[PDB]
């Protein structure tokens, strides 16, 4: 599990469940290619996006579909999604946790990277 | 104006208005003594808490009454208040902006220290 | 001045100065088209990106070049840039402040929308 | 495990290890009484602070000793500590995770509360 995404709700103080997550990888022609996708669990976590073999060095974009999450709770939020763009495995394989903390008009995102 | 407090509302994406703010200075006995207080303005700021002459080196505590703020809105909050504790140091000329971004179950606070 | 961007440095507790900022508007083809850009000022703000007349309803992307900012400081950053994607809506009178608070492996972004 | 504290480092993108944590409970005479204390592990987590039996309803203060953490890394941070003040178990027993994300001049804290 070299990539995990975790999403929390700062309004209710709870994991954000069923949040859609899309991962893309920058291609040789400078375009964002689809890499993996999924939805968070009851714990607000999304495991199994990828394997160490497939998760090669590159520039990755993690898009968390925060608007649909808020809408479904009856809230009209400011952002369309939260996006996280980063270079991965450029020094060798690492394990990445991408965490997002969501409010209707604000979010924070943090990476925890372990060897 | 060496000390300013600014509060934002992450749920509505607005300044947090009429929020009570209390500042304490730590006394020789280790107890907190009242130092300055007020309510934030329509822009979510609180100016004029102290002067250069009164704001001497020491340990200060800024308490932001977040709980009454959320209660007025109708949103169950987690925290009793937000607390920012720091030592004022002389270093050269310095202005302190204590900012706070509020969500019902999360807050962040940042110090912006400039000349 | 319907759109302003403000960037703070969480590691030094200062405005983030000379940070490049690019704004894109989403075209009919779904591609991002350049819309406005600049660098933050000594106060960490970027004013004058657009006018009321040009800032019509649509989907916008604000990209903040955080990676070059940390590189200039000497601190290894995680992210390639910070990205804020949102729909501008008409609704009554409105001013948009996109704020970003930067750390090497974390950032937060908040929209302050006022009249 | 009705109370857990987790601390992350936003400069390195890593758990904050060996961070001292002190918990107090408000006493009938309005004073902060010592309740429990400990230090975060290699995972940045602190388990075993208390038991469901001892963790009665009340107002609790969780003090995270962020200054000593930064100093030991050679950084002179702004805050003395991060403090989290909240009412607990006022609707029945809950499980509380208090998370703190640390930068030298900024921090955020979030509570995740589960039944």
Curated annotation (Swiss-Prot), chains A, B, C, D:
Changing residue 36 to D: In AMYLD1; amyloid cardiomyopathy. Changing residue 105 to H: In CTS1; amyloid deposit on carpal tunnel; patients show no other abnormalities. Changing residue 101 to M: Loss of tetramerization. Changing residue 75 to S: In AMYLD1; amyloid polyneuropathy; almost no RBP binding. Changing residue 107 to V: Requires 2 nucleotide substitutions. Changing residue 9 to G: In AMYLD1; leptomeningeal amyloidosis; leads to unfolding and exposure of N-89 to glycosylation by STT3B and subsequent degradation by the ERAD pathway. Changing residue 43 to P: In AMYLD1; amyloid polyneuropathy. It is found in: Secreted; Cytoplasm. Belongs to the transthyretin family. Each monomer has two 4-stranded beta sheets and the shape of a prolate ellipsoid. Antiparallel beta-sheet interactions link monomers into dimers. A short loop from each monomer forms the main dimer-dimer interaction. These two pairs of loops separate the opposed, convex beta-sheets of the dimers to form an internal channel. This is Transthyretin. It comes from Homo sapiens. The lineage of its organism: Eukaryota, Metazoa, Chordata, Craniata, Vertebrata. The chain holds residues 30 to 144 of 147 of the full protein.
